RNA sequence: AAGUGUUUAAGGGCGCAUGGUGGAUGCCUUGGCACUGGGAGCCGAUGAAGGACGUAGGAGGCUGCGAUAAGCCUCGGGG
């Protein structure tokens, strides 16, 4: 979704940001194709994406 | 008057020519068997071997994977 050459250089408040905004993004998309009115899967993939990287480096930095 | 004498096939048998089931035979391997030369010779409470369930826009099975569910990151080969 963004590259991590910004994703390393930017801080903690704001992966917290993009953190619940993704959740919330997970949240909307998963369940609009739950309903039934939204239709490709790539949305679910990068999303995944997403959380999983800011949770890795959510626990990279916080050993680091 | 007289005696003499083939003449039919319900079916059947035998050969001939055509067919019908049944898949041996000939030719093949994506498969198995037995060895040679090397590597590794262990895997698990930092949670194994094997499973259940789930995971795909689609209904099931194999395979991959695990609510982050036919996958994700960083790194380099390829187009
Ligand atoms: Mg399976
Ligand atoms: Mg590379």
Redesign the pocket.
Known sequence: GT??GE?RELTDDELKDKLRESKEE?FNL?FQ?AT?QL???RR??????E???V??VLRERELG
């Open positions: 590259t991590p994703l997970l998963r194709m039934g239709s490709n899967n679910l993939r990068t999303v995944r994406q959380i999983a990287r949770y890795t």
